[PDB]
Amino acid sequence: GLFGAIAGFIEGGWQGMVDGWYGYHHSNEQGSGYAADKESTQKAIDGVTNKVNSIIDKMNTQFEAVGREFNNLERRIENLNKKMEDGFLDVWTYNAELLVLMENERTLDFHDSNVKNLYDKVRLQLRDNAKELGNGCFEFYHRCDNECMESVRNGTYDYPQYSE
């Protein structure tokens, strides 16, 4: 994708994370486990829901065909009528199909961006205290227990403390 995260430097997604769209996998002394990021997942649900609602609402005042009848000596206006109604149906079919294609592309890049932003959020916190493997994971230099792992997810990691 545009942002290089999904199926990029993060090679695949996790079956193990059912809790949200984006999150963390930790592994320490206390154990290992998946944890979805609440903030980014919620933001994305909102963005995607609003998008869906917007698409429907813009198509809300669309053309509606009406039955009109013409006699044998009114073929010209009958044909004019047909091409008019077909004309608007073709315009709105185009509008609906193209909008879905374009917004689908944007939706996939939106998730890709969210994953990259989440990765950067952790990177800018950990800095020198972690080794960057290049696959979405950070190898700690200092030991980080369950409470230490939580401060990273919260965005309250205290760098000066773990300097060592």
């Binding site: 996998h25 930790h26 294609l101």
Partner: protein
């Protein structure tokens, strides 16, 4: 062996696919279909109101009262009207209905008529009023339209007819009458005595004077004669005046327009379906919360928006990995 944290994204067992501009069939974790592609194949009541199913009759056969259309002598309020592509029972006596399409257009904004008498058969003391045709059979015998009357000469005379009706109702009235175009001069005198005839019709806005047209025509429904029908809307407090010395197909009954609203004339071969719907098309009803459908362009009710698409699917989730 030292501790680590990883960043990742959701994957699942979804096989749902979407399209984008640059690639097709992208598997995503979540997708939302927005297109209704199914219907029930039936003609239903529209929100509790039954349609008028004309069966084998046309609008013309119904209103004029083709004897084959007696089922529809006094129909109740309707939600929409269904007519076959080629109804068998139309103008039994061959001819045409003047401004027929403009009349049908008016019907698309009416939900109920109440049929009333405007000229009683008792009015005709000096003319014969029993005229029939084998072109309008009923129970194997010659008959005629129910709502209009074929007047012919009596005692070898056809005195000038003067008839008026004043619309004392609070509703607009649809009035129908016709003219008979005979086969030849001899037929003209045989039926009407007078060789040169007219029908004049006046309201506050209508000013009509029709003259019959003799021509040699092909038999249609066994008859070479023709009848041409005309209509007007008579406003409350206005009156209609007819005058004729022959060839007059006189009104007996007319239609009060009592309920107006959304309606339509649907062309369909389908029968009544003993069901209820919020959205009806000519080929079946729709029960959906999808914003779009591809069933049929012509719909009535609370409906999704019609598009010609075979598929419309929004990606909601993300690219799903194998």
């Amino acid at each position: 062996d030292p501790d680590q944290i990883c960043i990742g994204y959701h994957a699942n067992n979804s096989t749902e696919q979407v399209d984008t501009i640059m690639e097709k069939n992208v598997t995503v974790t979540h997708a939302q279909d927005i297109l209704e592609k199914t219907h029930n194949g039936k003609l239903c009541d529209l929100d509790g109101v039954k349609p008028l199913i004309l069966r084998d009759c046309s609008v013309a056969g119904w209103l004029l009262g083709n004897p084959m259309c007696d089922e529809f002598l006094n129909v109740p309020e309707w939600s929409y009207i269904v007519e076959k592509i080629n109804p068998a029972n139309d103008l039994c006596y061959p001819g045409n209905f003047n401004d027929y399409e403009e009349l049908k257009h008016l019907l698309s904004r009416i939900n109920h008529f109440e049929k009333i008498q405007i000229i009683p058969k008792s009015s005709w003391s000096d003319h014969e009023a029993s005229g029939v045709s084998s072109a309008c059979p009923y129970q194997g015998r010659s008959s005629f339209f129910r709502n209009v009357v074929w007047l012919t000469k009596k005692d070898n005379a056809y005195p000038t007819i003067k008839r008026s009706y004043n619309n004392t109702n609070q509703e607009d009235l649809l009035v129908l009458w016709g003219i008979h175009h005979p086969n030849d001069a001899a037929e003209q005198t045989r039926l009407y005595q007078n060789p040169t005839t007219y029908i004049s019709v006046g309201t506050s806005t209508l000013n009509q004077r029709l003259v019959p047209k003799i021509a040699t025509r092909s038999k249609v429904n066994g008859q070479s004669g023709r009848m041409e029908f005309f209509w007007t809307i008579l406003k409350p407090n206005d009156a209609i005046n007819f005058e004729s010395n022959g060839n007059f197909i006189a009104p007996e009954n007319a239609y009060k327009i009592v309920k107006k609203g959304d309606s339509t004339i649907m062309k369909s071969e389908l029968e009544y379906g003993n069901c209820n719907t919020k959205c009806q098309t000519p080929i079946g009803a729709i029960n959906s919360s999808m914003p779009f459908h591809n069933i049929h362009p012509l719909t009535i009710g609370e409906c999704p928006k019609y598009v010609k698409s075979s598929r419309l699917v929004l990606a909601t989730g993300l690219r799903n990995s194998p």
